[PDB]
Amino acid sequence: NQICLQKTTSTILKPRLISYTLPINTREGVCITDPLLAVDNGFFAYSHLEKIGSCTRGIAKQRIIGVGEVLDRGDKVPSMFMTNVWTPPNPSTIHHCSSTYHEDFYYTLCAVSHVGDPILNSTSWTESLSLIRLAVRPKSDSGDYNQKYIAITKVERGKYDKVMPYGPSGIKQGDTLYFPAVGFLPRTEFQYNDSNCPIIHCKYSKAENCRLSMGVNSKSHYILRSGLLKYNLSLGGDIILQFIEIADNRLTIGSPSKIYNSLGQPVFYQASYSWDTMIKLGDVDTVDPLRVQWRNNSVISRPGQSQCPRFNVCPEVCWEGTYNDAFLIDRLNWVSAGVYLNSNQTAENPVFAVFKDNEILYQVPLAEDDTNAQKTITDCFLLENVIWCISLVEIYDTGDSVIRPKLFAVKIPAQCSE
Amino acid sequence: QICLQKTTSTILKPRLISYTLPINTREGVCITDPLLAVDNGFFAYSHLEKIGSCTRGIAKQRIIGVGEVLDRGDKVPSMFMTNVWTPPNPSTIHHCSSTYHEDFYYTLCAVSHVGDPILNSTSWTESLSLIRLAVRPKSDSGDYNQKYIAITKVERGKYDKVMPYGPSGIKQGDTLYFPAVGFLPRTEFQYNDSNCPIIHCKYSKAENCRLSMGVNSKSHYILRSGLLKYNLSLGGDIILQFIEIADNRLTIGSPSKIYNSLGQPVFYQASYSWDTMIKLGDVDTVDPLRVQWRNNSVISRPGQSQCPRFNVCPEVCWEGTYNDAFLIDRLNWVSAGVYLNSNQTAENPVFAVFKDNEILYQVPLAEDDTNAQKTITDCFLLENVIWCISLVEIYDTGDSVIRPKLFAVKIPAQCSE
Ligand SMILES: *[C@@H]1O[C@H](CO)[C@@H](O)[C@H](O)[C@H]1NC(C)=O
Ligand SMILES: *[C@@H]1O[C@H](CO)[C@@H](O)[C@H](O)[C@H]1NC(C)=O
Ligand SMILES: *[C@@H]1O[C@H](CO)[C@@H](O)[C@H](O)[C@H]1NC(C)=O
Ligand SMILES: *[C@@H]1O[C@H](CO)[C@@H](O)[C@H](O)[C@H]1NC(C)=O
Ligand SMILES: *[C@@H]1O[C@H](CO)[C@@H](O)[C@H](O)[C@H]1NC(C)=O
Numbered sequence A: 001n002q003i004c005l006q007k008t009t010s011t012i013l014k015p016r017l018i019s020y021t022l023p024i025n026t027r028e029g030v031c032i033t034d035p036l037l038a039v040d041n042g043f044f045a046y047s048h049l050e051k052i053g054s055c056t057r058g059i060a061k062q063r064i065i066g067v068g069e070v071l072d073r074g075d076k077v078p079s080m081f082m083t084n085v086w087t088p089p090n091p092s093t094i095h096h097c098s099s100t101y102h103e104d105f106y107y108t109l110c111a112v113s114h115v116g117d118p119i120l121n122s123t124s125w126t127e128s129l130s131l132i133r134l135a136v137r138p139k140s141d142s143g144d145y146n147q148k149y150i151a152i153t154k155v156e157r158g159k160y161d162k163v164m165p166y167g168p169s170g171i172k173q174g175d176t177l178y179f180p181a182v183g184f185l186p187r188t189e190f191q192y193n194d195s196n197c198p199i200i201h202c203k204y205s206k207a208e209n210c211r212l213s214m215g216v217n218s219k220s221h222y223i224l225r226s227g228l229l230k231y232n233l234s235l236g237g238d239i240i241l242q243f244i245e246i247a248d249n250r251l252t253i254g255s256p257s258k259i260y261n262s263l264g265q266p267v268f269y270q271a272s273y274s275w276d277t278m279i280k281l282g283d284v285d286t287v288d289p290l291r292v293q294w295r296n297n298s299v300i301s302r303p304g305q306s307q308c309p310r311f312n313v314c315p316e317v318c319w320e321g322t323y324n325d326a327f328l329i330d331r332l333n334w335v336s337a338g339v340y341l342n343s344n345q346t347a348e349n350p351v352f353a354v355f356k357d358n359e360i361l362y363q364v365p366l367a368e369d370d371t372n373a374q375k376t377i378t379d380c381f382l383l384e385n386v387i388w389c390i391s392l393v394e395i396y397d398t399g400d401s402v403i404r405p406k407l408f409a410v411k412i413p414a415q416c417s418e
Numbered sequence B: 001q002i003c004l005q006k007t008t009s010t011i012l013k014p015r016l017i018s019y020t021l022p023i024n025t026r027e028g029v030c031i032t033d034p035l036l037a038v039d040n041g042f043f044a045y046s047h048l049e050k051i052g053s054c055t056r057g058i059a060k061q062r063i064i065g066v067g068e069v070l071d072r073g074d075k076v077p078s079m080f081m082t083n084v085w086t087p088p089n090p091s092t093i094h095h096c097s098s099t100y101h102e103d104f105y106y107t108l109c110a111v112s113h114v115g116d117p118i119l120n121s122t123s124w125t126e127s128l129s130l131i132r133l134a135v136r137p138k139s140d141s142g143d144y145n146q147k148y149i150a151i152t153k154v155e156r157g158k159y160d161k162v163m164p165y166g167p168s169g170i171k172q173g174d175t176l177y178f179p180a181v182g183f184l185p186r187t188e189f190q191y192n193d194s195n196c197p198i199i200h201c202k203y204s205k206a207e208n209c210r211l212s213m214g215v216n217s218k219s220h221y222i223l224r225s226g227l228l229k230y231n232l233s234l235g236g237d238i239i240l241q242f243i244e245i246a247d248n249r250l251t252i253g254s255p256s257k258i259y260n261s262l263g264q265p266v267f268y269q270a271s272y273s274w275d276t277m278i279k280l281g282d283v284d285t286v287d288p289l290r291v292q293w294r295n296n297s298v299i300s301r302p303g304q305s306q307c308p309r310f311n312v313c314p315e316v317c318w319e320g321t322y323n324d325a326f327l328i329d330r331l332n333w334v335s336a337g338v339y340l341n342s343n344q345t346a347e348n349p350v351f352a353v354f355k356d357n358e359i360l361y362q363v364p365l366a367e368d369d370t371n372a373q374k375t376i377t378d379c380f381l382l383e384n385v386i387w388c389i390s391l392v393e394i395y396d397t398g399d400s401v402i403r404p405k406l407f408a409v410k411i412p413a414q415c416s417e
Helices: none
Strands: A021-023 A030-040 A043-052 A059-072 A078-086 A094-101 A105-112 A129-135 A147-152 A154-156 A162-165 A171-173 A176-186 A222-232 A240-245 A257-262 A265-270 A280-286 A291-294 A326-330 A335-341 A350-356 A359-365 A373-383 A386-395 A406-411 B020-022 B029-039 B042-051 B058-071 B077-085 B093-101 B104-111 B128-134 B146-151 B161-164 B170-172 B175-185 B221-231 B240-244 B256-261 B264-269 B279-285 B290-293 B325-329 B334-340 B349-355 B358-364 B371-381 B386-395 B405-410
Touching: A021 A059, A021 A078, A030 A094, A030 A373, A030 A386, A043 A094, A043 A105, A059 A094, A059 A105, A059 A129, A078 A129, A078 A386, A078 B020, A078 B077, A094 A162, A094 A171, A094 A176, A105 A162, A105 A222, A129 A162, A162 A222, A171 A257, A176 A240, A176 A257, A257 A326, A257 A373, A265 A326, A326 A373, A326 A386, A335 A373, A335 A386, A350 A386, B020 B058, B020 B077, B029 B093, B029 B371, B029 B386, B042 B093, B042 B104, B058 B093, B058 B128, B077 B128, B077 B386, B093 B161, B093 B170, B093 B175, B104 B161, B104 B221, B128 B161, B161 B221, B170 B256, B175 B240, B175 B256, B256 B325, B256 B371, B264 B325, B325 B371, B325 B386, B334 B371, B334 B386, B349 B386
Parallel strands: A154 A240
Antiparallel strands: A021 B020, A030 A043, A043 A059, A059 A078, A094 A105, A105 A129, A129 A147, A162 A176, A171 A176, A176 A222, A222 A240, A257 A265, A265 A280, A280 A291, A326 A335, A335 A350, A350 A359, A373 A386, A386 A406, B029 B042, B042 B058, B058 B077, B093 B104, B104 B128, B128 B146, B161 B175, B170 B175, B175 B221, B221 B240, B256 B264, B264 B279, B279 B290, B325 B334, B334 B349, B349 B358, B371 B386, B386 B405
């Protein structure tokens, strides 16, 4: 169905807090973090890590991976009902979970670590991946159907030393699952020409900077490269993953990414964790090998820090930024919808926006002006005739005894008045 | 089989039950006026969310919810909400009661624009309504998932007003029975003062039983507990019929609960007056309602100055707390529920398993000085093990969000270990 395509300052966006169920807790002094949200085919996947104390550095208490239905509550407004919850024995070992819906199940692929975040301790992390398959509609007195845990032995990684899921959600093509992922490649093996680093209109940029900034720091062992992890269900036996590296068009440090189907075709978002701060988003040209037709988008960036702030395009050695994805809602006019932090060098001020490449059509703040915020994950879908979007937004520093993200439901307007 | 010996061993091991609800939108919030029903592998739940104080705060959201009680995987019960209803105005819905029948929970509530009808009886113009929620919603149906019915036809006998007054009721065939209360004018109230048992009570007057049948001694109406009957076999008119409880061991109308256990119906009525010992027993007849109260002598409830725990002398008092119990063995008449172990303050919740004249085994749920009010227990079989779920109102040390805690307790077979 149609949507509003005119640039207007009218209050036609009316964000509401969505009703969603989870295992209800009464523990104080807790931070809910490392969120994941996937919405596909009338079902959803959700995850978090509960920490006691600090969000960044508290003692890990509970990890949950959960799935359920996204339903019409009665008055043509979406709700969410959890149906199946999985919990590991040790909360601190599960990292970088990514989820993909196929049939009956949400197949979630996580990394396993005893050295913390593999990104921050790459050389130490011995590569271990595993898959939690949860059924979106549990059946009593079945076997493996409801919950099944699989340790991945067979991993096909090309020329990369290590590979890992790196993103919230992926897609299905037939019976082949594609998770967003990243490859770890030694700097010395990294094939790259310094002449291709666009420093030509940048007085204080060096040719070396693009290459140097392909790692988490300038003297890091590995470089990171985004990609897909492929999992073909048609071979119904031993589980075998194949890594696919992203094309080098507009290349940037491997960063959390998302692949999703919208209006029949696949679309890619990659976070801008470096100097190329403008939003990276576009239709998938080919999936294997992965190649994106990045939009020449000129109005959506992300907050940085001193070295690589918002709207930066000059190559610099920096690892900073925040994942703030967007969802294509109209391909003919290429309009998307997502939440961006309206701030240059601090993670603040979340704003839900609907935008073309060179224009924000209409928007609305979700919190105040001085409200702290990090990750934002948006997924959009039809509920009968009407396009709806669900957005999980990390909101911190609030003073709550329990810091947890807030989930918004937004109706996209058809008319441009009112 | 269950353990039938009086034991001090730690054979009860309460655990926090996993249950899902819509996450709250904020803090500085109190979750109150709870309801919990468990029946036929499904559950019904309700609360009112207030901003600020529990008794004084700003009403923000009312939810009525239903869902499945499932085996999570390791033979331990879990709860999954499936269907949630919310009124436009949170402050108008009062005294909800729930009963399950064929795919639906039917909850029955008071509609008031004057607050709690109990505290504003003369002002409350009698309005009742029914929210029917499906325990397993189906997409692209009509009324099936949620249906709201305003009750017009009410048959109340000689009572001026009637109202649901309790968390849950039972089904018999296609006839639903909610716990309820009738409002009767004092002047119309037929009662002989000679039947007031003051004979072993130096400082009790004959008038006191009658006077204490109202919320205060000069109140317009008296309250009398009972059932509201709703027969589904007739279409065309949602008529409710009120049934007054029998006058055996009569006491001020107070929140009550009717439930089936081991094939037969059982009644609990709260002790909101001077007769402070637990009121509980098998239903003799349902219409008219008559209970075979147990001569139970070990379970009471905290009161206040005038009518404390273990009081049996007639006094003019409206005080007490709803703390029900669930029969788990009729042959030996053993029940299970949570009581507040305190004489004159609402404190110290203890899960107990007891005969009429004996507490067999028990365990504290919180500390000794932990504040607590209402407790609702429902028990059921899982694989072949008896389980009990207990919703307990608790107010902890400084807490940002005050909400009740739901416990799951396995009843032991052996008396050792
Ligand atoms: C990184 O790995 C080492 C093992 O060489 C481990 O001892 C150390 O604690 C890890 N650091 C972090 C950030 O946990
Ligand atoms: C998946 O496996 C089947 C059977 O080996 C093969 O025919 C098919 O082409 C594979 N699909 C992809 C896209 O890898
Ligand atoms: C962006 O612009 C470049 C050069 O003008 C072009 O090659 C590319 O296809 C454009 N992308 C889209 C999707 O318009
Ligand atoms: C952010 O940076 C841009 C360009 O560098 C500038 O136009 C804008 O005023 C800055 N915003 C604020 C409010 O600091
Ligand atoms: C309910 O109504 C039906 C239809 O008249 C009747 O057969 C049945 O006995 C009634 N049930 C009760 C318990 O009142």
